[PDB]
Amino acid sequence: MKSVVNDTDGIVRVAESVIPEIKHQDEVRVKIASSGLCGSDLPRIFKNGAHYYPITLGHEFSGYIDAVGSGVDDLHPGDAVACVPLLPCFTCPECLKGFYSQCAKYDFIGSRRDGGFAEYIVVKRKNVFALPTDMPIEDGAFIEPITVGLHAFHLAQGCENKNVIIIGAGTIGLLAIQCAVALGAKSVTAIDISSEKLALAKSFGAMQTFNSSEMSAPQMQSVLRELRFNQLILETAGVPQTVELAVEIAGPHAQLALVGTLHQDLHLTSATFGKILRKELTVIGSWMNYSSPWPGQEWETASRLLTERKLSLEPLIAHRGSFESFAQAVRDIARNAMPGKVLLIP
Amino acid sequence: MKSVVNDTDGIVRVAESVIPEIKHQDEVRVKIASSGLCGSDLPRIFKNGAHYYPITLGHEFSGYIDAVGSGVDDLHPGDAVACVPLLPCFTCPECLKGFYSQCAKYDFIGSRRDGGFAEYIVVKRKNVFALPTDMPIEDGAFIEPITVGLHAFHLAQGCENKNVIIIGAGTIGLLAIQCAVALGAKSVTAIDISSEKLALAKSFGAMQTFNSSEMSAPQMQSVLRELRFNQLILETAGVPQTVELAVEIAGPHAQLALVGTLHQDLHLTSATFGKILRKELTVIGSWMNYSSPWPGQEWETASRLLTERKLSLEPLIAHRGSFESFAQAVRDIARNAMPGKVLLIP
Ligand SMILES: [Zn+2]
Ligand SMILES: [Zn+2]
Ligand SMILES: [Zn+2]
Ligand SMILES: [Zn+2]
Ligand SMILES: [Zn+2]
């Protein structure tokens, strides 16, 4: 079988290996149908940011059950699933509190173990999430990235009647816009360094967009004056400038959910830091996308919003291809901006 | 009358001026009995931190009503009061929502206007808070700093049954320790560079202390393992190193309340920033100490805790003196650490 394997210093290869076998009663094998590249994968591929090399990435995927372990009674060959890539230990104090993303001993498909850029994969039963039978299987690869935004909304106690601001118009951000609209946000504003996805953002329901390469924070704050209360700002870009921006534009008692992980240091002036206090912001760290009961309401919500046609995935997709096509698309990224969702379609 | 007036390049003078007159029907004049120096005043004096110079500081004070304006019907000459130093406009959208500390046009006694390092001051009726008749007048000068900690607890939805960590053993911090104990915290831990102040913290009920000049963050986090859940951390020191320390030591889903204003920039590593997300911290900016109904439950609680003998003020006090003595004590501090509460007793 084929897979995409990344090695040190940005080399991408398509490799051949044996189909993995089920080794435990609680495992299943998935024949992968659709598998997406995450923004978080770019540092793993090009910036020697993976836990090990060689590695096969991929934690945003769907497919059909090919086989099940003898202890699996609620799934059958042919069933459609999405991958739930985190595997908590389920027995430490954090896990028993439902703090799965704080498990000290968790596995992660496509980061801590090999993942879904492959024709087949073997995972635990608890690492798959059954899809509605009428859901196009390709759509299943988007459930995991949908739940990222949903998890942040959940930590913020919802987005209903809030003035939502999404910073970063990558896939996670664009999905978050769609979810905010569907979940009853009063308004949604989208902010990004480029202007391309911003028209797209408006098509997804953002009522306005700010190009941060063309507007300063005070200019944005001025436009936001009427919408300054009950803000929920999601920082999805994961760069110092956008974390700073979020604090600078925030209205009184805004909630600021941090979704994007930084790869450079954050220097805040005393002035900017002071605004966190003066505005009495609530800054909410968000990590992964799970809650109790496992894998969490985020996953059910994502599935439901999709089935209800409240989300639109097609415009998000920049590339569809099998292994060679996908590998070259990944290579073509180098480390510039992500064009859109690059899908591997085995 | 005398007052303490500080000037550019850190000069502290004792000045003579005319007693202020009541000019409006809703003003009162207070003859000041006890007036404290805040940690926040040191940058105003020795670091070009004030809004203007020359300036008379002082926002932690008590005294007796000397005279009232024709429109004041509920206060009388001889009444004991503490100063409520913030004056919001009460007519902007922030104020109408009870967000007084985000008022777009607020005054502040001892920062934006001259304050209580003086024999007499004229303020609005809304700027005084009546004390119980049996409360020792000097105790009144501590109500405002008590409400600082209480306001942070309030924003965090209380400290009851929580594992409270107070970072900074200055007056604000030590008072917050006492309040946390009185309000039913599960545990209280104090962190500071001073073994002195930390012994005091233990005497106030802190079950353990960490000397940050001797212990590293990992060492502290190791000790905190048993108490890592349901943490509420108050950062009261207002220096970059203690904000960093707070994130580094925090347990899973800890609440971090930021009380201390920075007068230096904050440089967080990408790793430290990452911990905000990975631990799913909630970082709560806390600003001043007010809520609806004006001036807020914080003030009632402060008064009550004092009357109920749940707080201990004497050990907090490092100096009592009239104007020359007080002024020299302030000069002796410079940009060294605060010894404890320095009181002006006119
Ligand atoms: Zn991801
Ligand atoms: Zn665990
Ligand atoms: Zn103060
Ligand atoms: Zn106002
Ligand atoms: Zn720096």
Sign of CA dihedral A40, A44, A47, A49: positive
In the block, residue with structure tokens 């039913």: B184
Question: Which of A127, A158, A121, A155 is closest to A143 using CA atoms?
Answer: A127
What are the Cα distances from residue B225, in Å, to A94, A291, A328, B217? 12, 23, 47, 12
> What's the number of CA atoms in the CB half-sphere (13 Å) around residue B5?
14
Separation between Cα atoms, residue A99 and residue A59, nearest integer Å? 20
Domains and CATH numbers, chain B: 1-148+287-346 (3.90.180.10), 149-286 (3.40.50.720)
Separation between Cα atoms, residue A168 and residue A206, nearest integer Å? 13
Sign of CA dihedral B49, B51, B55, B59: negative
What are the Cα distances from residue A17, in Å, to A20, A56, B283? 9, 12, 47
Cis amide prior to B315 (ω within 30 degrees): no
Q: Which residues contact A304 (CB under 8 A, 6 or more apart)?
A: none
Separation between Cα atoms, residue B286 and residue B156, nearest integer Å? 9
Strands A11-16 and A2-7: antiparallel
The residue of chain B nearest to residue A156, with distances taken between CA atoms, is: B282
Sign of CA dihedral B149, B155, B158, B159: negative
Cβ separation A285–B284 shorter than 8 A = no
Task: Using DSSP, state whether B170 is helix, strand or coil.
Answer: coil
Sign of CA dihedral A203, A205, A207, A210: negative
* A83 known member of a binding site: no
Cβ separation B283–A283 shorter than 8 A = yes
Question: Which of B300, B243, B339, B333 is closest to B46 using CA atoms?
Answer: B333
Sign of CA dihedral A82, A85, A90, A93: negative
Yes or no: say if A12 and A327 are a contact pair by the CB < 8 Å rule: yes
Element (H, E) at B244: helix B240-249
Q: Which tokens hold the place of B296?
A: 């807020």
Neighbours of B168 (CB within 10 A): 26
- Phi/psi class of residue A111: alpha, beta or left (left: φ > 0; alpha: ψ in -120 to 50)? alpha
Mutation choice for B interface testing from A230, A280, A282, A290 by most B CBs within 10 A: A280
Rounded CA Rg of chain B: 20
Question: Which of A33, A16, A238 is closest to A139 using CA atoms?
Answer: A33
For residue A225, the CA-to-ligand 4 centroid distance in Å is 15
What are the Cα distances from residue A145, in Å, to A139, A142, A151, B29, B210? 11, 5, 10, 62, 41
Burial of B184 (0-12, 13-18, 19+ CB in 10 A): exposed
Separation between Cα atoms, residue B73 and residue B107, nearest integer Å? 23
Q: What is the DSSP string of A57-83?
A: ---EEEEEEEEE-TT--S--TT-EEEE
Mutation choice for B interface testing from A264, A277, A291, A298 by most B CBs within 10 A: A277
Question: Which of B245, B48, B62, B255 is closest to B145 using CA atoms?
Answer: B62
Question: Which of B86, B85, B103 is closest to B94 using CA atoms?
Answer: B103
Separation between Cα atoms, residue B203 and residue B307, nearest integer Å? 20
Name the DSSP class of A54: S
Q: What is the DSSP string of B275-301?
A: HHHHTT-EEEE--SS--SSTT-HHHHH
Rounded CA Rg of chain A: 20
Query: B38-56: string of b/e by CB count within 10 Å (b at 16+)?
Result: bbbbbbbbbeeebeeeebb
Q: Phi first, then psi: what are they for A282, rounded to 5°?
A: -115, 115
Question: Which of A192, A9, A4 is closest to A114 using CA atoms?
Answer: A4
Question: Which of A163, A65, A66, A56 is closest to A113 using CA atoms?
Answer: A56
Q: How far is CA B74 from the centre of its chain?
A: 27
For residue B271, the CA-to-ligand 2 centroid distance in Å is 22
Question: Which of B84, B175, B182 is closest to B125 using CA atoms?
Answer: B84
Cβ separation B274–A261 shorter than 8 A = yes
- The span from the first CA to the last CA of chain A, in angstroms, equals 10
The residue of chain B nearest to residue A263, with distances taken between CA atoms, is: B270
Q: Which tokens hold the place of B74?
A: 């509920």
Q: How far is CA B268 from the centre of its chain?
A: 26
Cis amide prior to A43 (ω within 30 degrees): no
In the block, residue with structure tokens 């985000």: B102
Q: How far is CA A9 from the centre of its chain?
A: 24
Separation between Cα atoms, residue B28 and residue B22, nearest integer Å? 7
Q: Which tokens hold the place of B141?
A: 């000068």
Q: Which tokens hold the place of B271?
A: 């790793």
Q: Which residues contact B135 (CB under 8 A, 6 or more apart)?
A: B80, B303, B306, B307
Cross-strand partners of B189:
B165, B208
Separation between Cα atoms, residue A5 and residue A13, nearest integer Å? 5
For residue B267, the CA-to-ligand 5 centroid distance in Å is 5
Q: Which tokens hold the place of A218?
A: 């005070």
Yes or no: say if A175 and A204 are a contact pair by the CB < 8 Å rule: no
Burial of A343 (0-12, 13-18, 19+ CB in 10 A): buried
Name the DSSP class of B97: T
Yes or no: say if B65 and B29 are a contact pair by the CB < 8 Å rule: yes
Cβ separation B270–A265 shorter than 8 A = yes
Element (H, E) at A45: helix A41-46
Q: Which residues on A lie below 8 Å from B269 (Cβ)? A: 265
Yes or no: say if A237 and A259 are a contact pair by the CB < 8 Å rule: no
Mutation choice for B interface testing from A233, A273, A286 by most B CBs within 10 A: A273
> What's the number of CA atoms in the CB half-sphere (13 Å) around residue A186?
11
Separation between Cα atoms, residue B299 and residue B309, nearest integer Å? 16
Separation between Cα atoms, residue A161 and residue A279, nearest integer Å? 20
Separation between Cα atoms, residue A294 and residue A275, nearest integer Å? 37
Q: Which residues contact A157 (CB under 8 A, 6 or more apart)?
A: none
Separation between Cα atoms, residue A181 and residue B108, nearest integer Å? 41
Beta strands in chain A (DSSP E): 2-7, 11-16, 27-36, 60-68, 80-83, 86-87, 107-108, 120-124, 128-130, 163-167, 187-192, 208-211, 231-235, 255-258, 266-268, 282-285, 317-321, 341-344
Element (H, E) at A244: helix A240-249
Separation between Cα atoms, residue B341 and residue B89, nearest integer Å? 31
Q: Which residues of B touch A (CB under 8 A)?
A: 93-94, 97, 99, 101-102, 155, 229, 243, 252-253, 258-259, 261-270, 273-274, 276-287
Name the DSSP class of A110: T
Q: Phi first, then psi: what are they for A324, rounded to 5°?
A: -65, -45
Q: How many CB pairs under 8 A join A and B?
A: 119
Fill in the amino acid letter for A179.
Answer: C
Name the DSSP class of B50: S
Cβ separation B287–A264 shorter than 8 A = no
Q: Which residues on A lie below 8 Å from B261 (Cβ)? A: 270, 274, 277
Q: Which tokens hold the place of A333?
A: 């990224």
Cβ separation A282–B283 shorter than 8 A = yes
Yes or no: say if B282 and A283 are a contact pair by the CB < 8 Å rule: yes
- Phi/psi class of residue A230: alpha, beta or left (left: φ > 0; alpha: ψ in -120 to 50)? left
Question: Which of B145, B96, B60, B122 is closest to B326 using CA atoms?
Answer: B60
Separation between Cα atoms, residue B93 and residue B99, nearest integer Å? 8
Please give, rounded to a whole number of angstroms, the shortest distance from the CA of A40 to a CA of chain B: 14
Separation between Cα atoms, residue B276 and residue A211, nearest integer Å? 27
Q: Phi first, then psi: what are they for A64, rounded to 5°?
A: -115, 145
Question: Which of A58, A122, A85, A104 is closest to A342 using CA atoms?
Answer: A58
Yes or no: say if B261 and A274 are a contact pair by the CB < 8 Å rule: yes
Fill in the amino acid letter for B135.
Answer: M
Cα-based angle A283, A285, A291 (whole degrees, multiple of 5): 130
Q: Which residues contact A300 (CB under 8 A, 6 or more apart)?
A: none
Yes or no: say if B227 and B221 are a contact pair by the CB < 8 Å rule: no
Beta strands in chain B (DSSP E): 2-7, 11-16, 27-36, 60-68, 80-83, 86-87, 107-108, 120-124, 128-130, 163-167, 187-192, 208-211, 231-235, 255-258, 266-268, 282-285, 317-321, 341-344
Separation between Cα atoms, residue A242 and residue B336, nearest integer Å? 36
- Phi/psi class of residue A159: alpha, beta or left (left: φ > 0; alpha: ψ in -120 to 50)? alpha
Task: Using DSSP, state whether A239 is helix, strand or coil.
Answer: coil
Yes or no: say if B143 and B299 are a contact pair by the CB < 8 Å rule: yes
Name the DSSP class of B115: -
Yes or no: say if A206 and A175 are a contact pair by the CB < 8 Å rule: no
